[PDB]
Design a protein around this ligand. Sequence first.
Ligand SMILES: C[C@H]1COC(=O)N1c1cc(-c2cnc(N)nc2C(F)(F)F)nc(N2CCOCC2)n1
Length: 794
Amino acid sequence: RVKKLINSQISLLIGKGLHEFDSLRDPEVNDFRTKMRQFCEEAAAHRQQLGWVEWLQYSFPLQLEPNRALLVNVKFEGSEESFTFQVSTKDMPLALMACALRKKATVFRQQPEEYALQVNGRHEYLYGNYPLCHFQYICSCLHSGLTPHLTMVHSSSILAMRDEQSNSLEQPFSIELIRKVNADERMKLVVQAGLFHGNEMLCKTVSSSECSEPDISVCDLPRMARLCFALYAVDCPIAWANLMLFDYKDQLKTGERCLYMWPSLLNPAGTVRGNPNTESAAALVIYLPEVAPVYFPALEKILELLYEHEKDLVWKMRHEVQEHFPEALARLLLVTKWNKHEDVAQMLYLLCSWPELPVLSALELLDFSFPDCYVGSFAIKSLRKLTDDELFQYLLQLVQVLKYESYLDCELTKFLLGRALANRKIGHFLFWHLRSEMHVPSVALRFGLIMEAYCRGSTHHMKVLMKQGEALSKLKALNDFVKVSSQKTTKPQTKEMMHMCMRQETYMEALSHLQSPLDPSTLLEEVCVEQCTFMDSKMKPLWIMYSSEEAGSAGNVGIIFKNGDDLRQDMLTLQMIQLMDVLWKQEGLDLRMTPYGCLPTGDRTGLIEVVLHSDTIANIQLNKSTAAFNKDALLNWLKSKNPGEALDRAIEEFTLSCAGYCVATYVLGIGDRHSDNIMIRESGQLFHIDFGHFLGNVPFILTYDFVHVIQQGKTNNSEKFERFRGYCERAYTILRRHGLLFLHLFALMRAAGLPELSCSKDIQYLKDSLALGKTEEEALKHFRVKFNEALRES
Ligand SMILES: C[C@H]1COC(=O)N1c1cc(-c2cnc(N)nc2C(F)(F)F)nc(N2CCOCC2)n1
């Protein structure tokens, strides 16, 4: 009964019963299940014998940054008696722990290596040989002015958490086209079939001969060949269906197949698995002739065997390309004749001795343009260099790429699960990236199986994620109530009844004491029902506040629950802005950005992190007790929050972040920016919210109200204004240098099916906004023309 409880909890957590998997009687699903279960359990066991600092690295990974004084409050576990030391920002955490043990021995009338520093009320720790200034928490405290509050956790306490979290021939390829079709009975049904190796067509779309019931050799068919079908009417499309010619066991598939079709001509990128709705979906009846069994040649036997003329020169000096331009691998792989086994064996032989490639080259090889499993394994082999922080930075894209995957057991799934089971922060976001897509039939089996496998290697983490899902379940029930109620009573009345609903023990228990799905290190402790509310927008989003005594003012955390809108594009936009910030900070440029959390959790559902101490441009402009001129409202609000000496740092914070968001919204093509979706923090930091439109679905924007604040309220201020232009120019030139990184990641995101990231037209927008094909001088002059055009429009 220890397994019956665990399995039913897994079913509940992943949003799919484990019985649904068994009832498929699918040897592939069964073989992924048992192989991945052992893989995950091995990792769980390796983790149960790690050292206490290694366990800290696992569950609470360090939050770092991409000579000065510091007052720090430090206390111990099991004692309210705090102590305020005065350490330097250049000191290591071990120096503070020695200071704390010195003050502890002096009071209690009495070794810092057996201790770790916990950030109060958070699952965040400070340990290692890193100066305090470089820990994100100390950095954030220094800028905010706040005193860092830490707790001296001993090794015997950390080890108790580890001990509490236990458990053949030239015969040309041919098909026989032998069902619930719904189309105009007056016209006729036609099926178009195409052979594909990724994007590349292996031969030519062999269509069919024009009711409700209806040039390639077999020896040259590549390992990952796709037979792609399209049911049209004769141009109105009806359905599509794809399948792999070779099975998961490398054997060539033979005999009849029933292809359950997806409703819409050819969709090569679409999954190679049938529609699960085997009741209403249209089906195609096909037959695979008998070649003999024939299993795709092994690596041992395989290794034994731009204009048109430019591609033939790249292929001729293919060995010179490996030995002198190894990074040009994708250029030669994209020129290889994938419909000729003779050239594919010669090309795969080169890839077997090809040196490793930088992560930027590996992220390119993960695109759909490279479906070969050998070239794909080489990509994950180069992708292991990825640091846990870099892997987190691209985790969303690596999850979308699983949609291109042709079989369930794959080296990307093995890698993602291996890296997830070695870091609880990576296992956390991998969980939510898969959980949030469980309502999508095409990914539900794949994602459902991965989440199950992870759960086998993390039974304690499953219980922690269960607590999150229960909170999200209650938030949907409270949000549906709020939607119905708001259409029938005054807002104050609905707010009072939302609070009574929340005050029920079913809700107080479920909504309290959980890790935030937006950030596992933020602990959501007591829900402040008096401070919770909903916004007046269509989906009545909930504004939920939390407090924690243990963390003081830092435990005051807000989250926004939204049901009814897709949050993926917002998440993507924010991740890109965070990447820009990391790139800018890597080149010594801190633009004081605010890349707050956005995490989709389910069907048109997700969370948004509340940034407290901020208001919208429109609310500051309609102040609540004056400005003689509206142009002075923002500057006056900044004066209200930053008296005397402080006003200068606030105008600087505004200038830097304004330059960052001006460049980010410009480069990413984010339009429809107005006083409602632009906010200012009391520090001066300007940031944007609600990114429902990107890639021009856009000129540089210079708002007069912001230029007035940048100019310290002066009508003419070239010293201030031109320093601002320098920031825009630097941030735009740093992002241009990493243009290939955004293009590769955006190319990987084509797998997500976001409507504003659909064809090459959308990717072209980024190339033009980043002016990549130009020299750095010509691009900077072009940006200058578009920036000067924005000041005149201001
Ligand atoms: C200004 C406040 C008041 O009325 C709002 O609507 N507000 C919103 C709205 C939103 C938001 C952002 N993106 C998307 N797609 N949707 C929303 C919403 F919650 F409305 F659904 N976010 C905030 N933030 C608060 C400050 O820290 C960051 C998050 N506040």
